Nucleic acid binder design. Structure first.
Ligand SMILES: Nc1ncnc2c1ncn2[C@@H]1O[C@H](COP(=O)(O)OP(=O)(O)NP(=O)(O)O)[C@@H](O)[C@H]1O
Lengths: 709, 68, 148
RNA sequence: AGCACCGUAAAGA
C-alpha cells in the first residue's frame, strides 16, 4: 500500500496548514525569504496568503482550498513573477476558454510576458508564462513538446471541476504525466479530503506538498427564504453562523398555509437598496421569460443608457451590417438599456462578453444567469437570489447540492462596497429542517474522481514505450482513493485472526481496479485493426491518435471503408456534425437522399462497432451508442456551407444559437484533426477537401473575436 | 452613483476605435550642379499601368488620377 | 495510372479494410511518431543538432529537446547554445525517440526521460530497418550479462 | 418545476 506521512504545523487561527511528505523523510519547516520580494502588494496579505507565498518561495508545491473572493489568485502571480525572475517558464491551466481570456488580459496588463493557447487562438507562445486549457497540456505531455523541459511551475485553477464525469480524467492524467522535478499549485474551493489529495500528490511525485484550508471570508452572508406569496423574508442563519430555525419553522408554516412573484421580489430588493442582484435560475426559458415580464421597470438614468448604447456599438461594430440586424441583438438591447440582463448558454458569445463587462461596471443590476457566473468569473455582487432549488444534471431531477449552492453564494459580497451580502432562496414545497439544514449549513461534497478509461488514452499510450495504462490506473485517484476504504474487511479479517475474504482482500489490497474494461478495450482494438497481438499499435492507431474531439474508431473505419472518397466538400462537414452535436431537439428533420444515404453507411459501421463491443462485453448498448450521434443539424450545416446568412439558419431548427456555435467550432477543430489524419495515411484529395470545408465555414460571427482579447 | 466609464474597461481595443559649424568659406554656399540618374525629372511620363475601353476600370480611374 | 492502381516497389501487397499498401523488403527508415531510434551526430548548427539515421534526410534534434544535467530545467539560453558543442560532440551517439515528422520528410526527435540521451562506450551494428519486429520495449537487459 | 399524451365534467352555438 502507499506509505505516506502527513503532518500539521503550529500556526495561528485564521487557517490550517498541513504537509504531506514521503513516509521516510523527516520534517524541517519552511524558511523565510532571501532578499527582495517577487511582487510587493498594495495591501497586507492574510495569514492564508502569506503562508502560501512562503511555501512558493522555498520551491514546494501547494494546495489551497478556500472560498472564492479570498484573493486566491495572489499565489499565482507570485509564482509567475518568481519564475520570470529565475528565467524559468510557468503555466496556468484554466479549463474554461473565457476565464482563460480574462486571466490572459490580466496577466498581460501586469507582466507583459505571457502567451495564450486555446482551441480558437494562439498568442505569444514563446512566453515564460503560458495561459491555456488543460487538454492542450495533455496533448503536450503525450508528445513531449518543447515546454515540459522548460516549465518548472504549473498552476491549476478549478481542480474541483475535476469532480465531473466527462473530464475528470484530464487533470489526473496530466498530473500522472508530469515529471518529479516539477512544482505546482492547486487553487480549489472548500474540500474536506485535502489530506488524501496531498498524500496522492506525494506518493505520485515522491515530493512533499502543502495544504492550506480555511473557512475565512471577507464579506459574510445573510441567508433568507421566500415562500410563494408569503410577502415576507424569514431569516434562517445570520452572519455569525447562528442558524435559527424559529423563523424557518414560521416559513414552513407559511408554506403549509398557502395551500408575478419574482417581479415582486426584485421590487422588494430594489426598494431595500440591495442592488445589484444576481439571479440563479436553472434553465433558459425561465431567465428569458422573467426578463420579458420585468421589462417594464427601469433601473438606470438616461446618460447611462446613452453610454450603454456607445459601448454596445463599439463592441458589435466588429460584425457585418446583417448580423447586427439579428433578433436577439435587437430584442435584448433595450433590456440592457434598462439595467436588467440575461446570460445563459444559448446566446452569441459577443453579447455574453458584453453583458459580463457591463455587469463588472454596474450598468445592470439584476442578472438572470443560471450557472455560468458560478464558476468562471470574478464579478461579485451585493445580493443573490435562487429562483428554485431543483435542477437537472446528468439524468436526475435532483435537488440542489450544497456544493453548488455555495459555489453560487460565494458570488454575493463585494469587498469594500458591501458590508455584507444578502442571499435569498425561493421555495414552493414542504422542506423539513433536515434537508434545509444539510443544504444551507451542510458541508461541501468530497472530491471523488471519475477516471473512466478512453480510447484516445489507450492508443496514445501504446505509442509510448516507458508508460503503460496499468501504470496510469495504479497512479490515479480512483485507486489511491480505494486504500482508505480497504481497512473495512481488512479490519474484519484482523479481528478473525471469513478466510475467503481474507485471501481475496489480501490479494486485493494493493492491486488494480477497472482492469476488465481495459482488456475489453484491447480486444476491440485488436478485432478492428487498431492494434495487434503482442499489444502493439497498427496504422489505424496512428490515424486515430490524431483525433481527440470525437469518437475516433468510427471515423477511422469510415475512412478505411471509403466514404469521404466519393462525397463532396460539405457532405463531410454534415457527417461530422452528426458527431459533434449531442443535444436533443423537438422535431427530427427531413433530409434529402444525397445527404442522408451516407448517414446509413455511417450507422452500418456504427452497428459493426457495437457488435464488436458487445462480443467483448463492454456492458454497452447498441441503440444508445448508435443514437448518441444526432444528425439534427446536417441541413443547417449544409446551408451554412453554401454561404448563407445566420438569420437564414437560426430558423431551420428550434434550437438556440450558442449551441450551434459550439457545434460549428468543435466541427472546425475536428476538421483540422481529420486533415492531419489524411495527411498521416498519405492521401491528399481528402485533406484538401476538409481544408476547403473549413474555408467554407468561417465567414462572419461563428469565429468572431473575444472582446476580452 | 457614477457618470463616467472605468479605465480597465477603457483600455480595451474595440473601444479605442549634437553641434554645428560656420565655415565662412562654405557657410552660405550651396551646390550648383547635382548628379541625377532619373528619367522623370529629366522628362515627364504617364502612369505605367493603363487600360483601353474596359479592362480593369480600376486602372482607368488610376489613369484619370495620376495623369494630371 | 489511367484508372488503374499500379505498384511501384517490389514486395508483398497488403489490403487493409479498404486501403491498399505495399510492404517492401528493403527501405530506409521512414519516420514514425513514437518509434525509438539510435543516431550518430553529423553536425552542430547554431540552433540545433543534425543527426544521421538510415533515413532519406538528416534527422534533427532541436536544442529545446535534449534533457539537461540532472533535472536542472529552467529554459534555454545562449550559454546552453555554447555548451551545445562541449557536451554532445560531433560524431557521438544518442538513443532517442521520435517527436514528429515534418512535411518535407525529416524527423524531429527528442528525449522524453533520462533513460534516453547520450550513450556510453558499448558497440554498435548497422542492419536493415526491415529486420526488426515492430513491438514494444526495444530496450532489453539480457541475463547474459549485457543489454541491447 | 416545466412541456407533451390520455380521459373526465361543464357552457355556447
Ligand atoms: N486580501 C485582500 N485584501 C484586500 N483586497 C483584496 C484582497 N485580495 C484581493 N483583493 C481585491 O480583490 C480584487 C480582485 O478580486 P478577485 O480577482 O475576485 O480575487 P480572486 O482571489 O482572484 N477570486 C483585487 O483587485 C483586490 O483589490
Amino acid at each position: 500500500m502507499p506509505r505516506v506521512k502527513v503532518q500539521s504545523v503550529e500556526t495561528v487561527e485564521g487557517c490550517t496548514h498541513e504537509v504531506a511528505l514521503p513516509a521516510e523523510e523527516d520534517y524541517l519547516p519552511l524558511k523565510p525569504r532571501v532578499g527582495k520580494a517577487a511582487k510587493e502588494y498594495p495591501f497586507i496579505l492574510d495569514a492564508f496568503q502569506r503562508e502560501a507565498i512562503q511555501c512558493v518561495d522555498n520551491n514546494q508545491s501547494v494546495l489551497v482550498s478556500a472560498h472564492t473572493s479570498a484573493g486566491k489568485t495572489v499565489c499565482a502571480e507570485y509564482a509567475i513573477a518568481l519564475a520570470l525572475r529565475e528565467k524559468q517558464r510557468v503555466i496556468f491551466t484554466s479549463p474554461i476558454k473565457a476565464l482563460s481570456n480574462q486571466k490572459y488580459r490580466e496577466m498581460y496588463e501586469e507582466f507583459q510576458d505571457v502567451g495564450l493557447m486555446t482551441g480558437d487562438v494562439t498568442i505569444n507562445p514563446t512566453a515564460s508564462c503560458l495561459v491555456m486549457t488543460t487538454e492542450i497540456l495533455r496533448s503536450m505531455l503525450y508528445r513531449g513538446s518543447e515546454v515540459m523541459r522548460e516549465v518548472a511551475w504549473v498552476i491549476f485553477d478549478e481542480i474541483h471541476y475535476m469532480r465531473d464525469s466527462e473530464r475528470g480524467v484530464v487533470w489526473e492524467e496530466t498530473i500522472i504525466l508530469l515529471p518529479d522535478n516539477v512544482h505546482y499549485v492547486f487553487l480549489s474551493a472548500t474540500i474536506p479530503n485535502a489530506r488524501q489529495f496531498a498524500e496522492w500528490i506525494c506518493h505520485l511525485h515522491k515530493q512533499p506538498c502543502h495544504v492550506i484550508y480555511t473557512d475565512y471570508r471577507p464579506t459574510p452572508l445573510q441567508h433568507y427564504i421566500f415562500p410563494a406569496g408569503g410577502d415576507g423574508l424569514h431569516l434562517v442563519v445570520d452572519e455569525n453562523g447562528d442558524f435559527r430555525e424559529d423563523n424557518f419553522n414560521t416559513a414552513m408554516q407559511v408554506l403549509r398555509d398557502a395551500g408575478s412573484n419574482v417581479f415582486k421580489i426584485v421590487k422588494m430588493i430594489m426598494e431595500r437598496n440591495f442592488q445589484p442582484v444576481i439571479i440563479f435560475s436553472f434553465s433558459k426559458k425561465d431567465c428569458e421569460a422573467y426578463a420579458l415580464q420585468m421589462t417594464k421597470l427601469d433601473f438606470n438614468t438616461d446618460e447611462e443608457k446613452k453610454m450603454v448604447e456607445e459601448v454596445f456599438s463599439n463592441a458589435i461594430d466588429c460584425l457585418s451590417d446583417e448580423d447586427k440586424k439579428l433578433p436577439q441583438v435587437e430584442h435584448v438591447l433595450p433590456l440592457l438599456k434598462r439595467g436588467i440582463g440575461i446570460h445563459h448558454g444559448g446566446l452569441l458569445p459577443i453579447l455574453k462578453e458584453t453583458i459580463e463587462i457591463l455587469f463588472s461596471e454596474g450598468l445592470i443590476k439584476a442578472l438572470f444567469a443560471t450557472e455560468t457566473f458560478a464558476m468562471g468569473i470574478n464579478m461579485p455582487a451585493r445580493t443573490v437570489l435562487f429562483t428554485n432549488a431543483r435542477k437537472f444534471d446528468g439524468k436526475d431531477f435532483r435537488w440542489i447540492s450544497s456544493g453548488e449552492y455555495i459555489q453560487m453564494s460565494g458570488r454575493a459580497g463585494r469587498r469594500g462596497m458591501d458590508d455584507r451580502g444578502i442571499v435569498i432562496l425561493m421555495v414552493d414545497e414542504k422542506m423539513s429542517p433536515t434537508i434545509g439544514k444539510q443544504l444551507l449549513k451542510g458541508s461541501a461534497d468530497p472530491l471523488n474522481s471519475a477516471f473512466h478509461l478512453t480510447y484516445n488514452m489507450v492508443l496514445n499510450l501504446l505509442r509510448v514505450e516507458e508508460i503503460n495504462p496499468e501504470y496510469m490506473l495504479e497512479k490515479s485517484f480512483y485507486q489511491f482513493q480505494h486504500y482508505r476504504a480497504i481497512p473495512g474487511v481488512v479490519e474484519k479479517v484482523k479481528n478473525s485472526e471469513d478466510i475467503k475474504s481474507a485471501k481475496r482482500e489480501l490479494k486485493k489490497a494493493r492491486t488494480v481496479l477497472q482492469m476488465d474494461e481495459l482488456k475489453c478495450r484491447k480486444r476491440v482494438l485488436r478485432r478492428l485493426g487498431f492494434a495487434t497481438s503482442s499489444d502493439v499499435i497498427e496504422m489505424k492507431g496512428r490515424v486515430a491518435c490524431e483525433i481527440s474531439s470525437a469518437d475516433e474508431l468510427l471515423l477511422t473505419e469510415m475512412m478505411f471503408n471509403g466514404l469521404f472518397n466519393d462525397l463532396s466538400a460539405e457532405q463531410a462537414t454534415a457527417l461530422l456534425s452528426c458527431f459533434v452535436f449531442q443535444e436533443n431537439s423537438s422535431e427530427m428533420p427531413k433530409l434529402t437522399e444525397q445527404l442522408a444515404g451516407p448517414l446509413r453507411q455511417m450507422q452500418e459501421c456504427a452497428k459493426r462497432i457495437a457488435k464488436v463491443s458487445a462480443e467483448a462485453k463492454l456492458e454497452i448498448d447498441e441503440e444508445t451508442y448508435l443514437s448518441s450521434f444526432k444528425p439534427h443539424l446536417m441541413d443547417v450545416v449544409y446551408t451554412w456551407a453554401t454561404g448563407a446568412t445566420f438569420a437564414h439558419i437560426c430558423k431551420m431548427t428550434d434550437v438556440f444559437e450558442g449551441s450551434i456555435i459550439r457545434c460549428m467550432r468543435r466541427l472546425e477543430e475536428l476538421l483540422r484533426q481529420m486533415c492531419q489524419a489524411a495527411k498521416a495515411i498519405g492521401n491528399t484529395e481528402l485533406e484538401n477537401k476538409f481544408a476547403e470545408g473549413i474555408t467554407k465555414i468561417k465567414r462572419d460571427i461563428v469565429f468572431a473575436a473575444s472582446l476580452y482579447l | 452613483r457614477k457618470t463616467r466609464l472605468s479605465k480597465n474597461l477603457l483600455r480595451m481595443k474595440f473601444m479605442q476605435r549634437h553641434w554645428y559649424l560656420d565655415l565662412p568659406e562654405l557657410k552660405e554656399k550651396e551646390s550648383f550642379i547635382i548628379e541625377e540618374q532619373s528619367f522623370l525629372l529629366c522628362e515627364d511620363l504617364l502612369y505605367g499601368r493603363m487600360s483601353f475601353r474596359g479592362f480593369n476600370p480600376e486602372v482607368e480611374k488610376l489613369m484619370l488620377q495620376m495623369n494630371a | 495510372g489511367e484508372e488503374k492502381l499500379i505498384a511501384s516497389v517490389a514486395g508483398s501487397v497488403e489490403r487493409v479494410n479498404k486501403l491498399i499498401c505495399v510492404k517492401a523488403l528493403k527501405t530506409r527508415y521512414i519516420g514514425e511518431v513514437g518509434d525509438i531510434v539510435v543516431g550518430r551526430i553529423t553536425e552542430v548548427q547554431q540552433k540545433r543538432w543534425k543527426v544521421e539515421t538510415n533515413s532519406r534526410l538528416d534527422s534533427v534534434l532541436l536544442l529545446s529537446s535534449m534533457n539537461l544535467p540532472g533535472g536542472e530545467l529552467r529554459r534555454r539560453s545562449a550559454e546552453d547554445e555554447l555548451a551545445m558543442r562541449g557536451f554532445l560532440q560531433e560524431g557521438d551517439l544518442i538513443s532517442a525517440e521520435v517527436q514528429a515528422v515534418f512535411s518535407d520528410g525529416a524527423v524531429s526527435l527528442h528525449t522524453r526521460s533520462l533513460k534516453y540521451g547520450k550513450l556510453g562506450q558499448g558497440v554498435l551494428v548497422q542492419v536493415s530497418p526491415s529486420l526488426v519486429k515492430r513491438q514494444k520495449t526495444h530496450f532489453h537487459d539480457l541475463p547474459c550479462g549485457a543489454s541491447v
